[PDB]
Design a protein around this nucleic acid. Structure first.
Lengths: 363, 363, 363
RNA sequence: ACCAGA
RNA sequence: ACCAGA
RNA sequence: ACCAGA
RNA sequence: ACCAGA
């Protein structure tokens, strides 16, 4: 029986994360200065004016790659006291150097904001192609109370964080799903229902989160910082960690649903010998998933190299069995597109057959 | 059998609370000064006058967000000696900074109360839209005896704490349920039956408890402080912990009733293989429920991010089975609305069928 | 079988008493000075005169809340040497501060008693609405022998302690039950049969014990001190612990009779699966009942928050089965009112059917 | 909450 | 999220 | 890569 | 040495 433990150790080394800290520092890329307009000063009034001048900055076809990513990092961190020590706390991206600039309110400037460069800010912040709210009776969302801005900012962030859930997996067919979360935070009284940003504003951001990678690394790594906050989180931060249950494991559902339907049901069609090698390369992917730490449900949001390893192509037979168990059990699995060049529908029909045979067949 | 314990550890890490104390302090939100008018001095007379001038403050359409929340925190803590060291004892909310001000009685002021700012208090405390008692022959509820005020304050609090039970779950259809608790504390002689605040006063408060989150964090976290009081509690505090049995787990009844009817009855339709994966993701939610501590029955009152995890959408088949067992056993389960996009009524009809088949069928 | 012990631990934590000593001291209510006229000096004569001037104080419509409760605490502790070190020994109520004053006899005062304030006592102690004995040929019950006063005080206390048995559960229909205990202590020669206080005197006290809560906490917590007295108790104290067998568990008979008829009979209709979940939430209420200690039969006399947990609404089916077994077995169960909004008479008729089927049907 | 209990 | 619970 | 998830 | 592998 010496072949067995020599086989299991063979799959616990080729299916092992490589050890690190071997690069001396000659892998770091050419940097890229990005511009994140942080809120200026203690006062609430200028950070509501900053949010107003930076939401309509995004709804603009004339904004670039870095100017839009720095605009989003500028508004995804307005919910904290002193956002400057949050951006440099979170960003460990090696391709983007944060050069973040303070924005203070003024009555001299055209937009109303200067940089702490009085009119140079007006070329930073400035009709049928400007993205804005759906109730476009709105002109400005500048307020002066703290709990007003806390509910407006919580409304704007709650429909940028739900973009992250399927900006990279189902970008085009995300419009119906993300509305069902907007309905969720409206009846929870988390957000205000009036201030729904339109299809064209969100399609700027959803296309942006999909097309660059350092914006997603900022959006993921602050979520991981929200989770570590021990006590009662602040209420926008609780909302971001509430949206997070839709963002985790988003793009690993050829692996999560393989576990949920192929493994956990335990039909008699797992003792097939053709699965016996593929239950071990799925056992080792569950050992690998929990030793990657808290960055493991985001491996395809962060789009690292290790999500090729959790792909269903390494277990093409036991995955198809789990799609057969999956679409026969739930109504919700009927909408899942599983179109791959390794499908083998003879085990998909064997997956459905074990469910239909075991209808009233208590084990 | 190495796949089995590798599977169970996989569900005891993705269904695990994240470890904390990783934020250095850069998550804390922008603060918000709130105004909680605490009772002034040792004497009973000014805290009955404070209760009188602050109940009718709430029945007013001209009061704001923070002024109403500070009015409620002002009256939900009048039942203790020195309420100032209760508010700063309870409030660990990061979005609200308590600036609490002492209120002393006077004969110079219009309302009768000054701040320890003689007439500035009159703009703080001051007909068919002013909410007040149903027997609106009442003008004032200022008294001078201690046991009188102890019964009037116990009457006002006992119909604010029953608002919390379903302010966030069934806000609109709470009017018939909360009356059945008002009838309970009338025949127990806990409250006085005359001083029933009307529909329009309570709909200010029930809408308030629903729409902001730092008021609920104060209402929850003093309940958790009432429970820790070892000996005989004071009688208003015993009443709050008595109302508490209706506030606990309020919004988790897709999980509590899944345990009560799906699990604990133990019909032969739990050995279905389609439930075998969903009895383990319900076993791990019972491990998670008791290691969250004493803040776990209030997770949807506090509206944290972990009540998405106890949702019935993660076990959509075994939940529907338990609604089928549930509505067939009790008359009371017929009023429960369970309308979700994952219902699958083929197991709801299988849930009813196991009850009807097992009518006189002792195991 | 890992779901089973994970289920049983889930019900031994949500159905668990919360741990205590977490309040630093900021729960304690506003105090309330009460006036308990203790007997003055060693001599027997002034404590018989104190009892005389304080029984007719209670039969008076002009006495208040605190003056009546302090009058009752004044006479419920006359049976001990030095009653002053009994009141401050018993009262751990946080809402009532005992300010107890010594009463000495005199020939200068109108009532005959001064305070150790010669005429100020006459406004403390002073016809068809004055409650007094039924044989209202009696003018005074002042005596001079010790065994005379020991039998008069034992007569007055034995019809105040039987008020406590159902002052809070069946207040209105207690007049026929409490007479059957007065007949019991008359043929035992415990009391004197002549000195029966009338309906109108006792309806002052029974309404008082029902309407305030700190009087019941004094009446309960001295009963618990009577029980701890090791040797032969004094004879009035033996009588109070003799009345106590009617005061214990008074208001828990939807739980005691559920145990007595539903559980202990062990008909074949307990192996129903619909009861199998409700025999475990009744098993855990028997674990909870004996770890609450010696204050557990008085939880609804003390009216704490934990008697909502022993309510029949948490086991609405197995309770109705036990009312069906109950009213079919005894004549005495026919008088029990069990009218609740969770009755489900299909198991009440199933409860009666198991008794009628098992008539001469020895197991 | 409601019965009977020397 | 929605029932009943002295 | 694609579903559903108060 | 030769396949497939978001």
């Amino acid at each position: 029986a010496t072949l067995l433990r020599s086989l299991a150790l063979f799959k616990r080394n080729k299916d092992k994360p490589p050890i690190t800290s071997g690069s001396g520092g000659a892998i770091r890329g050419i940097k890229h200065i990005i511009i994140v307009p942080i809120p200026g000063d203690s006062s609430i009034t200028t950070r509501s004016r900053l949010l107003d001048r930076l939401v309509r900055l995004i709804g603009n076809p004339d904004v670039s790659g870095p100017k839009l990513t720095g605009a989003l990092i500028g508004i995804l961190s307005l919910f904290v006291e002193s956002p400057g020590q949050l951006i440099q706390r979170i960003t460990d991206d090696p391709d983007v150097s944060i050069r973040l600039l303070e924005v203070v309110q003024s009555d001299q400037s055209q937009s109303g904001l200067t940089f702490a460069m009085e009119d140079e800010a007006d070329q930073y912040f400035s009709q049928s192609r400007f993205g804005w709210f759906e109730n476009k009776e709105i002109s400005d969302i500048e307020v002066q109370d703290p709990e007003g801005f806390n509910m407006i900012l919580g409304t704007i962030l709650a429909q940028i964080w739900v973009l992250l859930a399927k900006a990279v997996t189902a970008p085009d067919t995300a419009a119906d799903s993300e509305l069902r979360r907007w309905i969720k935070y409206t009846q929870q009284r988390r957000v205000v229902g009036e201030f729904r940003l339109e299809r064209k504003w969100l399609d700027v951001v959803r296309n942006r989160i999909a097309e660059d990678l350092s914006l997603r690394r900022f959006m993921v790594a602050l979520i991981l910082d929200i989770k570590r906050t021990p006590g009662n989180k602040p209420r926008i931060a609780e909302m971001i960690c509430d949206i997070d249950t839709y963002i985790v494991e988003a793009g690993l559902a050829s692996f999560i649903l393989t576990i949920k339907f192929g493994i956990e049901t335990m039909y008699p069609a797992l003792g097939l010998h053709e699965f016996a090698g593929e239950l071990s390369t799925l056992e080792s992917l569950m050992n690998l998933y929990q030793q990657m730490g808290e960055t493991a449900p985001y491996m395809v949001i962060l789009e690292n190299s290790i999500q090729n390893k959790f792909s269903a192509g390494s277990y093409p037979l036991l995955w198809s069995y789990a799609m057969g168990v999956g679409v026969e059990l739930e109504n919700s699995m009927g909408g899942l597109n599983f179109g791959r060049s390794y499908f083998d529908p003879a085990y998909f029909r064997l997956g459905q057959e074990m469910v239909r045979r075991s209808a009233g067949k208590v084990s």
